[PDB]
């Protein structure tokens, strides 16, 4: 957090004005929530590989 | 409580247990005298109002710094603790008079 650092541009560009502070909170929530679900779900499938319905659904509905 | 200094001790003398309890109480570790921790009722509060300015102002800072110590959950260094022998009652003379005044006032409404 020093002379030419990422956070210095991060504060001035966005956090300097409270109006743009809320924008990154709502826009950041959009991109965080989309990545977090896919990120957290993909772990669940790895823990339960070959367990849930979607891992054995291909065995039916004319696919097998 | 912990093992008494002598060997283990059940109840030896009287000053030894009082000295042992003073360090056990732990208000000296915060830089507070005994009368800086008393309960402030309608009696003690008046007896505080009669304190001299030098003594009352000293009490304020001792309480003020103790709350700072309690806020950080810290204690004063080993050399800044209130020595048991050096502890003196700066409020007992003022409490006693309010005790005397209140007892006289109460018994005057009884007789």
């Amino acid at each position: 957090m020093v002379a030419p650092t990422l956070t210095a541009r991060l504060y001035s560009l966005l956090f300097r004005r409270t109006s743009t502070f809320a924008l990154t909170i709502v826009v950041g929530a959009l991109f965080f929530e989309r990545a977090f679900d896919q990120g957290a779900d993909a772990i669940y499938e790895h823990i339960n590989e070959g367990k849930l319905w979607k891992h054995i659904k291909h065995k039916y509905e004319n696919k097998e | 409580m912990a093992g008494r200094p002598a060997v283990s001790a059940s109840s030896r003398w009287l000053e030894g247990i009082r000295k042992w309890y003073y360090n056990a109480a732990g208000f000296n570790k915060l830089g507070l005298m005994r009368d800086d921790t008393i309960h402030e009722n309608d009696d003690v509060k008046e007896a505080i109002r009669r304190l001299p300015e030098n003594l009352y102002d000293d009490r304020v800072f001792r309480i003020k710094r103790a709350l700072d110590l309690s806020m950080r959950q810290q204690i004063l260094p080993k050399e800044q603790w209130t020595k048991y022998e050096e502890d003196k009652s700066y409020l007992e003379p003022y409490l006693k008079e309010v005790i005397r005044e209140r007892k006289e006032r109460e018994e005057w409404a009884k007789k």
């Binding site: 823990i47 070959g50 319905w53 054995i56 039916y60 | 030098n54 710094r65 700072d68 806020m71």
Partner: protein
């Protein structure tokens, strides 16, 4: 006998904090219910539509539902009439009233299997041990007619003929229908029939841990930052003379 035996803690595919149910076992677990349990055990809280997306497809479950006839209320002439079941229909009740159930058996009333996993101490571990725990009564114990010895059952005398044996049914996928294997599938099914939310329970649990594992250090930072003013605060007493 009137004595208690602690069920063993059988490892399960869903015993972990994040482990989910094995839906292959659920499909085999239902086959035990529709062939063995359903003869004299009821499940009146699970529908044929619940199996969709869990162990059977929509077309598979519709075929299962239509395989059993059920009642469809009053006719145009105000009379009862049979009809093939639908997805919305609950599992068929073997008997109309508990009095009939006590008459079918030797007085014992078969408990509902919808919550029997969560309505018994030990969960599926006790049920699995109860199904496979049958043994010859020890010397000195006399059992009346219609009573069988099962140590895992409280009282050690249960009104249950052994319901599971080797090759009692045939599994669709071809797994051997052994005494222990069949009990494992129905125990897996009986858990799903009791806690259908089991998979989503852990799915949101993992999301919480990742979500809260990140916010808790962050929220702590805001607390420390706001309180850093008072933590680093020096007091000086400078009275006159």
């Amino acid at each position: 006998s009137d004595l208690e035996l602690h069920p063993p803690s059988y490892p399960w595919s869903h015993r972990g904090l994040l482990s989910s149910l094995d839906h292959t076992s659920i499909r085999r677990g239902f086959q035990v219910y529709k062939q063995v349990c359903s003869s004299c055990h009821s499940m009146d809280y699970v529908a044929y539509r619940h199996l969709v997306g869990v162990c059977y497809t929509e077309d598979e479950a519709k075929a299962l539902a239509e395989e059993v006839e059920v009642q469809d209320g009053p006719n145009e002439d105000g009379e009862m009439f049979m009809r093939p079941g639908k997805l919305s229909d609950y599992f068929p009740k073997p008997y109309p009233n508990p009095e009939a159930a006590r008459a079918a058996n030797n007085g014992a009333l078969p408990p509902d299997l919808s919550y029997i996993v969560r309505a018994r101490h030990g969960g599926e571990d006790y049920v699995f041990s109860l199904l496979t725990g049958y043994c010859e009564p020890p010397t000195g114990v006399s059992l009346r007619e219609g009573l069988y010895f099962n140590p895992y059952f409280p009282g050690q005398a249960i009104g249950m003929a052994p319901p599971i044996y080797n090759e009692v049914l045939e599994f669709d996928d071809g797994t051997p229908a052994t005494m222990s294997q069949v009990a494992k599938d129905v125990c897996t099914f009986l858990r799903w029939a009791a806690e259908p939310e089991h998979d989503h329970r852990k799915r949101m649990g993992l999301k919480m841990l990742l979500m809260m594992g990140l916010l808790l250090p962050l929220v702590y930072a805001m607390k420390r930052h706001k309180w850093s003013v008072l933590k680093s605060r020096k007091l000086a007493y400078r009275p006159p003379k």
